[PDB]
Symmetry: C2
Subunit: 371 residues, 2 copies
């Protein structure tokens, strides 16, 4: 009775807090700029070394001549990506741009060159500092020394990736080129992940990242996300370590084993196995992967899993999950209230998103997958 | 079961929020200054008109020569108040001082003079802008036009008075001179009430404010607070309008009726009648008056009173009061959480104090008094 009223108050409040966080993290001017007579000269590069080298372009921090104190990055493409991405509403984890133009760029700036040639130059306000590939490459020693801290950051990056991929579903868009060098890391007022490079995007060697259904005769992005889990854990592409899985219809025991090094290793292993299911109809959805990642970060632990399996009735399982939700929502609400007397981190926003929209039915589905 | 856990979390959190608010409202240097060779010349008065005229002194804003940019007020006394007040720990609603000395003050500054004479000069960091007597005198038209807004401010000032009087009880100190010109109104980083003038304080015409037990042959401050309720509502002292109550042992029907003009009028009438009980053993305590004022401001309304009287059992009454507490604590917690994304007012702190320490037993006692 009254318990339902307080449950509704916390749920509606956390949704409002999540929306308020979203508007605070997404604030800023987004009107596209106008370019004309030598707009390449209006961008004074603040450095000669690149600030980021992605799979589709090179990035340079620049001072726009008509606004010299705000952050701008010059994206010099290597060779459709703008057409597909411009049709999407803005999203925290999907790359935005404020204009583009052609320009003659010196070859000394391009690593894949060196005669002056014309290239597509894109301007963005979210300056990338590195890619996830660069982060993974530089974090081998930290993964060995601090497996709990590193593998938690992996879950947080994967959670942002699922959010951006979930944004593509209502458009019926598949990225089709999810590689670690296409995921950028930027700051927020470098832990903000940004999906980029839509050159292979579909609007409704290289085959090592193609789902099995593509090779035989809309779960492509889910399958490529399963490969990324291995790579972010400093493991090779499973279809490069065992290059005979694509020529068969493998099972769970055929996939290479993820080392058991942190409280997140078993869940990430189960998540990858579900994403790498050779049958598309049984391959989990990217929203289910999001729920798994939320569960590994904040959701109910394996200690509650034992009570879940031991409960004979669905009513007792619903009470167990509902009690966990009510307590976690209360704790998070207290956390926000205490900050009003002392900022809001990215993890606080994502945690509010989880508890605000989670239900006992959604938790029951995620738990049964992780069992 | 789980309901008790969430109830304990909210209660412990609101107590922590109230303590954090208290430390934020009480922050500032409080070390006493040192005075010597002509310290009266080190206080440059920023104006020649007084900033406040209390019952015991006149106040002038001043710039201290050794700290010329901070707020200081010069308190020039008219004639023990320091001895009793200095022995008390600091309190939000009790006057603090940072030093005192003798000085020859020009008669033009003193309204009760005009030959130069020596006076006791007290320095305080909380600058008074007016007294409650001045506020009541200037708010006659607003009481007639906006009775709901004015009589709510009266409850808020009376609540702060009860807090300061409650601070005196563990010291066994009675003020014995609670008059509207002795209550100062200051700002907070003018709604902050400050009790001053401890010249008549006891440490364990004029008789119109003396309790009946004093006239016949430790409830003195409670009795004088009941007189203040009438005066703050622009009514005369009940023992001046009906100057024959002290020569008898009056009842509730003998006291002058407070006009019924706002949702707070009936509660303030009942509160005054309890504070003006001629029998000290039946006169309510100043902590009970605080609970009544908290109930009139935020506590359960008369709509819940009908359900209270209709409940036959104590269990159902306890459930009614507990459900009200759980909902109100949830609402207030949400309010603090929403401010973490957008300051904290004095009323927010006082409301947190109420809900954090209120119990079903304390509410049941306050309700039965107001019935």
């Amino acid at each position: 009775e009254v318990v339902g009223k307080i449950r509704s108050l916390h749920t509606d409040a956390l949704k409002k807090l999540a929306v308020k966080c979203e508007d605070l993290f997404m604030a800023g001017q987004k009107d596209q700029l106008r370019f004309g007579v030598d707009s390449w000269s209006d961008f004074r590069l603040t450095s000669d070394k690149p600030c980021c080298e992605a799979g589709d372009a090179v990035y340079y921090t620049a001072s726009y001549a008509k606004d010299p104190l705000n952050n701008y990055a010059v994206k010099i493409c290597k060779s459709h990506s703008l057409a597909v991405r411009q049709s999407l509403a803005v999203h925290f984890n999907i790359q935005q741009d404020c204009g583009h133009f052609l320009a003659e760029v010196p070859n000394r700036l391009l690593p894949w060159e060196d005669k002056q040639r014309s290239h597509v130059v894109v301007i963005t306000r979210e300056v990338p500092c590195l890619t996830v590939a660069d982060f993974v490459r530089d974090s081998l020693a930290q993964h060995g020394k601090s497996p709990d801290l590193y593998e938690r950051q992996v879950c947080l990056l994967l959670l942002q990736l699922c959010s951006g991929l979930e944004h593509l579903k209502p458009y019926h868009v598949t990225h089709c080129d999810l590689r670690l060098e296409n995921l950028l890391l930027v700051h927020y007022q470098p832990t903000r992940l940004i999906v980029s490079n839509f050159s292979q995007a579909k609007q409704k060697r290289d085959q090592s990242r193609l789902a099995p259904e593509i090779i035989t005769a809309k779960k492509c992005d889910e399958f490529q996300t399963g490969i990324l889990i291995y790579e972010m854990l400093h493991l090779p592409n499973p279809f490069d370590e065992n290059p005979e899985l694509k020529e068969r219809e493998y099972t769970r025991a055929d996939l290479p084993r993820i080392p058991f090094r942190s409280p997140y290793s078993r869940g990430l292993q189960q998540l990858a196995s579900c994403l790498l299911n050779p049958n598309p109809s049984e391959r989990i959805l990217i929203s289910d992967a999001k729920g798994i990642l939320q569960c590994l970060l904040w959701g109910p632990r394996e200690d509650l899993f034992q009570t879940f399996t031991a409960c004979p009735s669905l009513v007792q399982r619903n009470t167990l999950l509902q009690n966990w939700l009510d307590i976690k929502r209360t704790l998070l609400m207290i956390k926000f209230a205490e900050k009003s007397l002392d900022g809001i981190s990215l993890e606080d926003w994502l945690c509010a998103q989880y508890l605000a929209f989670a239900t006992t039915d959604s938790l029951s589905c995620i738990v049964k997958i992780l069992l």
